[PDB]
Symmetry: C4
Subunit: 349 residues, 4 copies
């Protein structure tokens, strides 16, 4: 979905005076056919009849005008009403797959001029936006709230399962009993969860000002999940991996690749092709997750800690003095590392 078109969709998103007018028009079963231009003179050959207005835009004015037959011409910045009650005459030879004169005119006119045209028919409650060779149908808020509320409820269930997987993983991590199956299962659930977020994003955007609570909910449910998955990938990949690399593996499984167990464990660098194999592959966390998240050790410095001790298990055996040899670890960070791991072992295992 081009960014060019997304800028146009903003024009009619909940919160704008234009959208407010269009909601009133839909509510009254008036139709609408609206043409957005910056220089009316340049387009005087596709504009016939009607009334020259040249007056400041308002929602109420647009509403009143739409009671009349034909079309309305506004400035692109939606600050002026230029014409009302006009006949729009785009080139009839331009292909269109729309139905009815109103929507066939709209799509032809947008194709012909490279401008936005908005059509509302009298009996439906959708707003059809046309820009160049684009068509975007904009939905009512109540339809969008419904899908988004469902998506959020779905995200809650994925997130709860993710937390359960993770808390079990933690236990296994601290006891050094993790298998590849355990990692992959946890990553998959994380990947799927953020996929759902990506898929609902267009709905969220369409909601405009009415999507504010929805965005807050997404943010709260997904807050640290991306960082968490990146750290897991750095901790459990077959060979050592830089952060931005792990970030890309996340990007890949969120958007382009399917998060099947074999696919994940393969891209983590393991050579398995049967799902049952994962249970037999023993893995040991590098320790990045615990270092950044719990001991609050910056990644740049955690590299050196992993450089020296290789795995979490060995880090958990190091004394404060042992840790202090690392490039970046003073007594502050050394006790942070030492005490936070041991605290965790005590309470969790």
């Amino acid at each position: 979905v081009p960014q060019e078109l997304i800028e146009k969709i903003k024009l009619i998103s909940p919160g704008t005076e234009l959208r407010k007018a269009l909601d009133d028009i839909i509510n009254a079963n008036f139709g609408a056919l609206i043409f957005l231009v910056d220089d009316p003179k340049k387009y005087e050959d596709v504009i016939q009849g009607g009334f020259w207005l040249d007056t400041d835009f308002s929602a109420e004015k647009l509403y009143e005008l739409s009671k009349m037959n034909g079309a309305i011409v506004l400035s692109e910045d939606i600050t002026k009403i230029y014409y009302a009650n006009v006949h729009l005459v785009p080139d009839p030879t331009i292909p269109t797959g729309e139905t009815g004169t109103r929507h066939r005119t709209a799509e032809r006119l947008a194709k012909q001029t490279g401008k936005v045209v908005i059509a509302v028919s009298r009996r439906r409650n959708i707003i059809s936006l046309y820009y160049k060779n684009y068509k975007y149908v904009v939905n009512q808020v109540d339809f969008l709230i419904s899908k988004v509320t469902q998506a959020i409820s779905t995200l809650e269930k994925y997130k709860d399962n993710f937390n359960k997987l993770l808390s079990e993983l933690e236990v296994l991590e601290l006891e050094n009993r993790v298998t590849l199956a355990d990692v992959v299962r946890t990553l998959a659930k994380g990947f799927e969860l953020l996929r759902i977020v990506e898929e609902i994003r267009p709905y969220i955007v369409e909601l405009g000002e009415e999507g504010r609570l929805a965005r807050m909910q997404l943010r709260e449910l997904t807050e640290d999940v991306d960082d968490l998955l990146v750290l897991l990938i750095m901790d459990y990949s077959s060979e050592e991996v830089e952060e931005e690399t792990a970030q890309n593996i996340l990007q890949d499984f969120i958007t382009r690749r399917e998060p099947s167990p074999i696919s994940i464990s393969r891209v983590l660098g393991y050579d398995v092709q049967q799902a049952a194999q994962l249970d037999d592959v023993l893995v040991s966390a590098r320790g990045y997750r615990l270092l950044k998240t719990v001991a609050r050790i910056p990644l740049s410095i955690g590299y050196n800690v992993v450089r020296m001790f290789k795995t979490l298990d060995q880090i958990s055996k190091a004394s404060v003095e042992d840790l202090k040899k690392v490039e970046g670890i003073g007594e502050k960070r050394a006790r942070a590392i030492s005490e936070s791991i041991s605290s965790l072992k005590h309470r969790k295992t």
Copy 2:
């Protein structure tokens, strides 16, 4: 609900171009009477008047045609519009319990020809589908989302109670203090939960493409519940039971039998007839649940482990070497069994 009819319901489920047309028609309070055939010539005696069209189907075309009186005839694959504005004349002597000419014609015509007929009346918002001697009323999405959203909320409450029962059961299992009441109570709640899933399934299907988020939610809430109940049955039945057997006992209590406490404990092989007796019956888990789920030991091999040690309590006493005598247990699986049980005992009991 025959699979034959379910295939027909798909034709008008959310997501299809046909359903899209019918939603528009309902929205406009046009009526509709639609007859699905593959060879119009064969049915020319029940088709009178109207217009021969023989043109490609589209939703917009169907919508336009439905503005006219009478009926429309489409191909069974919904790829052609054959006739519009026709008079349908099924045998008047065919019994029908429908009301009004439109729906009496629809049901007679479907009975007579063995084909699908769809009726929409002008003032109601339901789609009535008729196939042979079948009638299926298809609901609007908003009605279906409402029931399904409620069903899901109900499932959440059952699932939370199930998790509480289970976590208590776990504690009892690990301390070897389980009574039959504890098992039965946990199975019952599990059985009821999956019953609710079975009952809402027809709603989910009716939702078609609009049921996608709903299916994801069901999947997340019920993910491992069936396996879990099967393992419980294998662990607590009076005498040893094969997996597929336990699977059938699950099937029975989900569909045909009522999950009353006495009924469950009876079919598990216990001879009680008063609910108060269950508290006095001491049981000891075989260990299948812990072996498959936590130690990741495949069922086929767990059989041998249960063969040798009989109960979880005895398995928890076995040393690695002890376990290693089993057909299938190498040092890997032996430490898996040993360490995962002891880890659990430590953290939970």
Copy 3:
């Protein structure tokens, strides 16, 4: 709300053929005026004109008839349609506070005859039922689902807070550090929760068949809460209290009395009048809750256990042999008591 009237409300609750007819009638903005009798002859002086039908009831027939002016007369069991299009002429001198002829007739006629009369006006979507001197307005399902869904969401929040209070209470109970404030706070939240249930009950009933999922949700959220509160009262009242007594104290605080902290602790037998005092009053559980709920000891027998040891703290000190002296405690129940308390102390404190 008299049970007499509740039986009448059932006649028009979701799920009945009559309610189905009335929904169609409301949906079509026909009005309705319906008179329920068992012997039409006896009431021939209030019935004028119209058509004598004397035919079997169906929803579709009622719907069709309601297209005509005037009133319809059905049998009380809603199995016969007796009259349509009649003029109802109750005594004009009978007081009524209704508006419009339709509803003034309905209430006068019900008062005069002691029968049910149903009025639906054309522009509103409510069903007004009149029985004797009673009027009950029946709501649409969508209005009721909305309030009930909210009530349930509210119950979830009360229940979560109740579980938190209880789990803290447990800890305090097991360490013998409970204060009156802790008990009262927990009872209050429990009392309020079940009040909400009582208040939403009329909505649930009005929903009829459409209230099925709602009832399941209530049941899951409140399952053991009443028993739990009764046991708390038996454990913490100033002097010993029989079960049915504690049951009544529950009944009182659910229905007639306000669950303020002073009020609760006063009726539990404590002489405080300032809320700040509760923090200074030390209490020790009798042990009924733990005995019935965790050790599965029947109340009748728990009495003897409390008879002998007085408090949970002392019960937790008793050896198996010690416990075995009680009337009803064999080695089975003695280890149940002993082991379940100690297990709990280990895991929780």
Copy 4:
């Protein structure tokens, strides 16, 4: 939003007979123009024509009258209907930004007289209230329930994250390993949560009687959160702070200031300007939170306890006799302090 105007909004809030009338009027697409006065004679120059009624108010009467053209005049206490079908003639020179005669009259008339005027137009479903130079649009309940239900769902997600932050904080507090980042992160989430409450409050008020369940939900979700945040501020501010002071810092971050991490930690008295610094600042709780909340020690007395021991860590080392030296601590409060801390250390760390 002036309290003066809020009193007027109450007049038309769900639950009032007036609001009930207006809902019926909106439902029937009648319009309404209603003028609230206490002495009709004083305003006889803006009231022309119509019918002098001088009769008791009821919703049904208002509904009936509104079927006529023009305006209705009620007493300010909404106990009398004075006029119906009148022509309202406010000074035409009074500025107004409203559209259509009905709403331009309403706003001019309210400005001119200092009284309330209510306008309902025929095609929209909003109630416009005008008081002096104020305009307040009152929404339908279904619109308000939607936003409020969303707000509550959002609050649930904030509250869960708050509980997670807090439980981690607790662990850190008890082990004396807290950093400023940990405090600030927890305060921020708390501040944001209560902001959401403040923002939804106007919606809650607009709901009137229909906001009852919504208020209960807010109360349950936010019950002790303010006290909790105040105690955190007293425990972690750079230098000692009185309760009412901490209360104001809460007030500030809820209403006027943005709860950014640097902003919070700055006003707590720490001199940081880079967010990454917070991880390196070690802090030790004074102990107010644990003293008031868990040991049930009144703040007034906790002051003396903090006076003597300075920090929670030192309080946790004190023996009963040690504690008893404090002004206000007898053996009761001394064991309360001692035992509740040690209990917590055992179970949590």
